[PDB]
């Protein structure tokens, strides 16, 4: 599912700017 | 047509009143922009309590003003580290913006000052912490709840853009919730005065507009793209474009394809397709009718813009009130604040 794909991305925490 | 005479006259009058408000707000901004405030407190006016956030060039701490007992959030920047990391212009610009703007959803700089070692910006303390934490905890916000926050961002960007400021930093991590449930925007490190175009690659991968990724000159329409990303992430619980690595995120952003959860209303999907529009000649916020294409969209039909501005709408969510409670911020190791006997980098920071 999309939610599972989100978890799998490893990008569920606070995201840094470039 | 869509409106009878009474409704059309009311809408026209409201839109003309916005123009009148913004013209006055620009005049006030420009006076402070040209004559910034400096040196309005000193370090020994405050007791340090606890760290609320940390970064490469400094930290934000909860402090208490010794005489009033009021709590504030104090951003501390090490002058030598700012120079080393090439952030002089960003640091000076952030303070100059903060002392010049005035809007109910933009954090207020109460004091600023510097000493031999550091720069200090003393801002309002916003005890509800970041939207990010609440969103990840609750999972997603219902559409009315997302809309309440989105309306505040719309008005804030309408204000900032009237001043020729592009924001460039929108994401849940950068939105704080106050004790009345309203949003506070705090970080102006990427904001820039831009009447036309600019070119810097800056922002956060999930929130970057296609034209930034494609190394084009770009304008304030990148903030309207980012609004679309924010609304999507508030209402879904995850952003529209994600992947394990930024390059795969960028491929999705530029593709012109976005997919929606089945619980999104048709009105929401229509708004998002118009905000997350790769073609700049079609993106809402970038057309002849400007911000009005967004404010007059069906998804916002129940939004009383003036009542939001006046903070008269009951918020959908009030963070747990525990006045110096730090529960809605993360825990960090406490490092000392050392001030040298010798002034460092005085010339670089004259304007601060
Ligand atoms: N209250 C209050 C308050 C808090 C911050 C702040 C707290 C945590 C992290 C950060 C920075 C910048 N955005 C997210 C990345 O790290 C800022 C900034 C101003 C404030 N007036």
Q: Specify whether the CB–CB gap between B270 and B298 falls below 8 A.
A: yes
CB of A3 within 8 Å of a chain B CB? The answer is: yes
Q: Spell B169-178 as b/e; 16+ CB within 10 A means b.
A: bbbbbbbbbb
Report which secondary-structure segment, H or E, holds B281. none
Q: How far, in whole angstroms, is CA B289 from its chain's centroid?
A: 23
Q: Specify whether the CB–CB gap between B223 and B161 falls below 8 A.
A: yes
CA distance B226 to B203: 10
Tell me whether residues B259 and A15 touch, CB distance under 8 A.
no
- Is B55 close to ligand 1, i.e. is its CB under 6 Å away? yes
Burial degree of B346 (CB within 10 A; 0-12, 13-18, 19+)? exposed
- Is B131 close to ligand 1, i.e. is its CB under 6 Å away? no
Q: Specify whether the CB–CB gap between B37 and B112 falls below 8 A.
A: yes
* DSSP calls for B62-97: EEEETTT--EEEEEEEEHHHHHHTT-HHHHHHHHHH
> Between the CA of residue B16 and those of B81, B163, B293, what are the distances in Å?
47, 17, 15
- Is B125 close to ligand 1, i.e. is its CB under 6 Å away? yes
Residues preceding discontinuities in chain B at C–N > 2.5 Å?
322
Please state how this structure was obtained: X-ray
Provide the annotated binding site of B for ATP. 52-60, 75, 124-130, 171-174
Is B331 assigned a catalytic role? Answer: no
Burial degree of B16 (CB within 10 A; 0-12, 13-18, 19+)? exposed
CA distance B265 to B289: 24
CA distance B151 to B5: 26
CA distance B76 to B337: 9
B130-313 CATH pick, 3.30.70.20, 1.10.510.10, 2.60.40.10, 1.20.1300.10: 1.10.510.10
Angle at B173 between CA B244 and CA B276, to 5 degrees: 65
Give the tokens for residue B225: 């793209």
Min Cα separation B244/chain A (Å): 4
Burial degree of A6 (CB within 10 A; 0-12, 13-18, 19+)? middle
């Amino acid at each position: 599912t999309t939610y599972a794909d989100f978890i799998a991305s490893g990008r569920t925490g606070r995201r840094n700017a470039i | 047509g869509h409106m009878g005479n009474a409704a059309a006259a009311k809408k026209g009058s409201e839109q003309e009143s916005v123009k009148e408000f913004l013209a006055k707000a620009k005049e006030e901004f420009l006076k402070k922009w040209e004559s910034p405030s400096q040196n309005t407190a000193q370090l020994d006016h405050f007791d340090r309590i606890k760290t609320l956030g940390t970064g490469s060039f400094g930290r934000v701490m909860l402090v208490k003003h010794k005489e009033t007992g009021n709590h504030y959030a104090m951003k501390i920047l090490d002058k030598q580290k700012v120079v080393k990391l090439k952030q002089i212009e960003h640091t000076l610009n952030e303070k100059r913006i903060l002392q010049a703007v005035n809007f109910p959803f933009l954090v207020k700089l109460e004091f600023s000052f510097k000493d031999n070692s550091n720069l200090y910006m003393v801002m309002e303390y916003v005890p509800g912490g970041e939207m990010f934490s609440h969103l990840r905890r609750i999972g997603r916000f219902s559409e009315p709840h997302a809309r309440f926050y989105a309306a505040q961002i719309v008005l804030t960007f309408e204000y900032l853009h009237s001043l020729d400021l592009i924001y460039r930093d929108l994401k849940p991590e950068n939105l704080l919730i106050d004790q009345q449930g309203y949003i506070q925007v705090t970080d102006f490190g990427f904001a820039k005065r831009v009447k036309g175009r600019t070119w810097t690659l800056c922002g956060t991968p999930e929130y970057l507009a296609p034209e930034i990724i494609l190394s084009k000159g770009y304008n304030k329409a990148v903030d309207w793209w980012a609004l679309g990303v924010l609304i999507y992430e508030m209402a879904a619980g995850y952003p529209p474009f994600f992947a394990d690595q930024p390059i795969q995120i960028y491929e999705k952003i530029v593709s012109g394809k976005v997919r929606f959860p089945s619980h999104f209303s048709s009105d929401l999907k229509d708004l998002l397709r118009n905000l997350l529009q790769v073609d700049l000649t079609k993106r809402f916020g970038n057309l002849k009718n400007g911000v009005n294409d967004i404010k007059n969209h069906k998804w916002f039909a129940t939004t009383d813009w003036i009542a939001i501005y006046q903070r008269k709408v009951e918020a959908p969510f009030i963070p747990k009130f525990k006045p110096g409670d730090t529960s809605n911020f993360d825990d960090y190791e406490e490092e000392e604040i050392r001030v040298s006997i010798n002034e460092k980098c005085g010339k670089e920071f004259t304007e601060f």
